Amino acid sequence: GFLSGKRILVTGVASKLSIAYGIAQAMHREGAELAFTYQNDKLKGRVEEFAAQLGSDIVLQCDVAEDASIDTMFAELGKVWPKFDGFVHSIAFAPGDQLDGDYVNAVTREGFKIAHDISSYSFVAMAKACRSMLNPGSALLTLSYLGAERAIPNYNVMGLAKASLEANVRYMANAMGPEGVRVNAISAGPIRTLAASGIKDFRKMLAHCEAVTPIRRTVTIEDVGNSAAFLCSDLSAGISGEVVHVDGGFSIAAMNE
Amino acid sequence: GFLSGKRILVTGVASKLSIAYGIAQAMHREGAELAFTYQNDKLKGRVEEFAAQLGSDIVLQCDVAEDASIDTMFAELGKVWPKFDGFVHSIAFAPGDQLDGDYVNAVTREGFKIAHDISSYSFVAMAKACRSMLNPGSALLTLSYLGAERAIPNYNVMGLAKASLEANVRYMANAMGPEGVRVNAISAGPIRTLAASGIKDFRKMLAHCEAVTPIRRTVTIEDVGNSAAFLCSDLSAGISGEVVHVDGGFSIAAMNE
Numbered sequence A, B: 001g002f003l004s005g006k007r008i009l010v011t012g013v014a015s016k017l018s019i020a021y022g023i024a025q026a027m028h029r030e031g032a033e034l035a036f037t038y039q040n041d042k043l044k045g046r047v048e049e050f051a052a053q054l055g056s057d058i059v060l061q062c063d064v065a066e067d068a069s070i071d072t073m074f075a076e077l078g079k080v081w082p083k084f085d086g087f088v089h090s091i092a093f094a095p096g097d098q099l100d101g102d103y104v105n106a107v108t109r110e111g112f113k114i115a116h117d118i119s120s121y122s123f124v125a126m127a128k129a130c131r132s133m134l135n136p137g138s139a140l141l142t143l144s145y146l147g148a149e150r151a152i153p154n155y156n157v158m159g160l161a162k163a164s165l166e167a168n169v170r171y172m173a174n175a176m177g178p179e180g181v182r183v184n185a186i187s188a189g190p191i192r193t194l195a196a197s198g199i200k201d202f203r204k205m206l207a208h209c210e211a212v213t214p215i216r217r218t219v220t221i222e223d224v225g226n227s228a229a230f231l232c233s234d235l236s237a238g239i240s241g242e243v244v245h246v247d248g249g250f251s252i253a254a255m256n257e
């Protein structure tokens, strides 16, 4: 595959529905060697199972909330991969109470803090910790959402954390470009996953993008995987600091009845 | 003036070079009752003098890093202005060690948290505490910078705080819109203010700017003040959730010399 000889670290796999899973699966198919990380003991087991199915045995614990967790994880990976070619950042969170009802009433100082910490800072924190481990031609990828560009109901504070994420992509790309590292983000459309259920009225938010999206269907984790495999391959050598929308054109249309 | 009959609260006035100062002169010029706030006692004096010249003896203290300080401030203000027509958010901050050098190396979890808290969250925090005191037709204004749109050297983490800030403007305007409140932002070009010296290489970041800018000069707190006065008056009742560029058209040009 166009990803042979590459060693990429994939994070955020929680179930077969996880987007990171569609990404791992697609990269595996293109010949890359994968590495996985799990947040806690609750997920360890299923991640080891998935890693096995994808011919990998490197499964490390990592909570982007603590710099120590990140340093230990990368120091453990370095034992098998003195150097690798980038990682997929598919992590996000915000207390549930934040994603329900009026934005101004729901948002709090703490919720805001948590959302920005786990969903935007963790991306650079990881890059900082493995910077000297990355080979030239490496790519770093994160996953954003339209909420970053437009104001979407109930998405609330996450929207702000994502705008911050996308800005991160541009500052990271510009900072690491000379060393030969590329940084991009995929702005995926609504997908039926596990964390997608935390957003109030989601079953409807999908049926909307359904009949309004140019391609007349929502994207699948497969659609996203293919785009991430590419954005992480040497085929996208000229793309950096970009946020490409993989939503089937939903964002470039307006008032489709 | 076009602001007669409007009561506006202005924050961020530190010297005569402050943008917030330029904004207050214009509004008062357009016939507007003003109220000023100061971060700490070190500035209490200056603010009182400026407030006197602008026909105002309402000078409250307020540290956006504290929910309680924001609560008391509007509690005090409520004694004179049981209801007012909005405020101008001219507040931003980040530890100096975040604003110099390679972004990936400079950024820290602490620096990130603070920058987003003071420069972005405070804006919505203020709206929470005075939401019931606003009249229909009120206007909220904040200040941003092109760093939220592009990767600009040394601006580093402040660029991510601003993107969050600009997204905050869209989420706030969408939530408060049905209440007759408009929320907008002005993306200002480089101005010689008291906090501008805090950015690594600014005098040269200003010398370059006034050379490649369509209007061939850097904006002044006057140009900003005037646009601010307009964005807060009923004259701009058709604008909400917008980020207007008051930078002489610099952001639209490319490759000049």
Ligand SMILES: NC(=O)c1ccc[n+]([C@@H]2O[C@H](COP(=O)([O-])OP(=O)(O)OC[C@H]3O[C@@H](n4cnc5c(N)ncnc54)[C@H](O)[C@@H]3O)[C@@H](O)[C@H]2O)c1
Binding pocket: A011, A012, A013, A014, A015, A017, A018, A019, A020, A038, A039, A062, A063, A064, A065, A089, A090, A091, A092, A093, A118, A143, A144, A145, A146, A187, A188, A189, A190, A191, A192, A193, A194, A195, A196
């Ligand atoms: N689902 C969508 O429609 C959609 C659309 C656009 C973007 N995204 C983004 O895709 C990414 C993944 O979301 P998802 O849809 O696959 O949901 P998901 O529930 O399948 O996975 C989310 C992951 O976040 C991980 N995580 C949470 N906190 C963590 C922490 N502190 N440390 C390490 N890992 C942590 C979880 O463990 C989990 O694996 C997110 O960035 C998300 O916002 C999703």
Ligand SMILES: NC(=O)c1ccc[n+]([C@@H]2O[C@H](COP(=O)([O-])OP(=O)(O)OC[C@H]3O[C@@H](n4cnc5c(N)ncnc54)[C@H](O)[C@@H]3O)[C@@H](O)[C@H]2O)c1
Binding pocket: B011, B012, B013, B014, B015, B017, B018, B019, B020, B038, B039, B062, B063, B064, B065, B089, B090, B091, B092, B093, B118, B143, B144, B145, B187, B188, B189, B190, B191, B192, B193, B194, B195, B196
């Ligand atoms: N200077 C520029 O060229 C420029 C360009 C675009 C946007 N802006 C923005 O304009 C705004 C004002 O900056 P400025 O250039 O007038 O510098 P300034 O030094 O004149 O004012 C900055 C203000 O921030 C206030 N502040 C900081 N921490 C605070 C806190 N915890 N609580 C309450 N107030 C606090 C300061 O006290 C001060 O008044 C900022 O949002 C800034 O980023 C400035």
Ligand SMILES: Oc1cc(Cl)ccc1Oc1ccc(Cl)cc1Cl
Binding pocket: A091, A092, A093, A094, A095, A096, A099, A144, A145, A158, A189, A190, A191, A195, A196, A197, A198, A199
């Ligand atoms: O960003 C998202 C956008 C969509 Cl349309 C659906 C799910 C998304 O992802 C999340 C939303 C809230 C929390 Cl707390 C965690 C995650 Cl992973």
Ligand SMILES: Oc1cc(Cl)ccc1Oc1ccc(Cl)cc1Cl
Binding pocket: B091, B092, B093, B094, B095, B096, B099, B144, B145, B158, B189, B190, B191, B195, B196, B198, B199
């Ligand atoms: O945003 C700004 C943009 C420019 Cl060009 C000049 C000054 C700016 O304002 C700040 C920069 C850094 C810190 Cl710590 C605080 C403030 Cl108020």
